[PDB]
Each structure stands twice: as C-alpha cells, then as structure tokens.
Amino acid sequence: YRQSMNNFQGLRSFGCRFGTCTVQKLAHQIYQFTDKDKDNVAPRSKISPQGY
C-alpha cells in the first residue's frame, strides 16, 4: 500500500527547468483538484489503480 508523498506551499515542488519536474509536470495536478478545463483526457481513463 502507498499514500501521499508530501504537502506544502511549494518548496520541493520544483528542481529542473524542464524534464520530469517542471511547470508542465507540476501543472498536471493544477487541473486535478479543480478540473476547470479539459482536453479529452482523464486520470481514470488513462490508468486504473483502483485506489491503491
């Protein structure tokens, strides 16, 4: 089993200008807690961990 990794304003939420830890990889969640916009894609449609 696994759980959250962390939580804060934004201290360790960045390190590389581009790659696997940039505004692009971070914004992935920016629209996950609000989901204001959509582009024919969802976290459930892609993967299906079934709450693991």
Residue whose pair of structure tokens reads 């960045």 in the numeric block = 14
Contacts of 23 (CB under 8 A, 6+ apart): none
∠ CA 40-2-32, nearest 5°, is 25
CA distances from 33 to 11, 12, 28 (A): 19, 19, 10
Q: Are 26 and 13 in contact (CB under 8 A)?
A: yes
Class of residue 3 by CB neighbours under 10 A (exposed 0-12, middle 13-18, buried 19+): exposed
Give the helix ranges, DSSP H, for 1-52: 23-30, 43-46
What's the DSSP call for residue 31?
Answer: T
- Which among 9, 45, 46, 1 has a CA at the least distance from the CA of 26? 9
- Which residues touch 37 (CB under 8 Å, ≥6 apart)? 31
